[PDB]
Structure 1
């Protein structure tokens, strides 16, 4: 990419959000996608197969360019997994009682959530992120018969196993 219009591989990053099935309403990326040798349709519908077999409730979506190859990975977002940690999937055409539904445990699955929080956080080790991603709730409301409310004060686990 540099004095004159060069490249030298294609290993260039682009990130997208949102996802029903895929797209397709005379639309996908454009702007970044078209000049880049990608398309709007085949590299759209191959974004189905990988962002599929269950994602249908908004996604984050890194697409890596290689010549004209668009790699369709679903990189997990902290609230997206906590929406998919739900008593899950009702999907579309009802839904209707809406997405403020809100009752889901994640007792050690938030441990697995704060585990898969890959790098991002620049972390004090669990016992603080456990509280960061525990505190970001609105749907669920903490562990079987509790509220996030009173986990924040304490967490008698994780701490010295994650370092």
Structure 2
């Protein structure tokens, strides 16, 4: 029996207080083993929370990582990760490559719930300032850059 469930995991870091026993417990498979398998299957994220889908059968489950738009933005932003102490004001400072935004727009077009590419670049660059970074200037600069100088295929 196919059962699709959503789990917002903390990434490669193993969380102490889990939220796996009420959802997976009555199905049968061990939630500690589920958390260990998700922490092994993430691997390269190591910092962020990802809404991973799990397709559970009668025998065992399968893990499918679904990256969000903000998840891809903070994945593209490469900072050194810190410890469990988590020092305050860890808000992101840097510069996002525009080709990375093009790649995220192509992946969101492959997921295919949007307008065509001109809309996807605008909405992902609008989520970029909600993440809190800028491509050599903020969103009103890229609004001016979109006018008569677009780079849409």
TM over 0.5: yes
Match of 2:5, SS? strand
User: What TM-score do the two structures reach when normalised by structure 2?
Assistant: 0.58
Q: Which is greater in Rg?
A: 1
Q: Segments of 4+ in structure 1 off by > 6 A?
A: none
5+ unaligned residues in a row in structure 2: which ranges?
Answer: none
What CA distance in whole angstroms lies between the structure 1 residues aligned with 2:52 and 2:34?
A: 20
Structure 1 residue 143: Cα displacement: 1.8
Q: More helix per residue: 1 or 2?
A: 2
User: What TM-score do the two structures reach when normalised by structure 1?
Assistant: 0.56
Structure 1 residue 77: Cα displacement: 3.7
Structure 1 residue 76: Cα displacement: 3.4
- Contact 1:10-1:67 within 8 A present in 2 as well: no
Structure 1 residue 13: Cα displacement: 4.0
Total equivalences in the alignment: 153
Give the superposed CA RMSD: 4.2
What CA distance in whole angstroms lies between the structure 2 residues aligned with 1:38 and 1:74?
A: 22
Query: Cα–Cα, structure 1 residues 148 and 61, in superposed 2: closer, same or farther, change >3 Å?
Result: farther
Query: Cα–Cα, structure 1 residues 111 and 88, in superposed 2: closer, same or farther, change >3 Å?
Result: farther
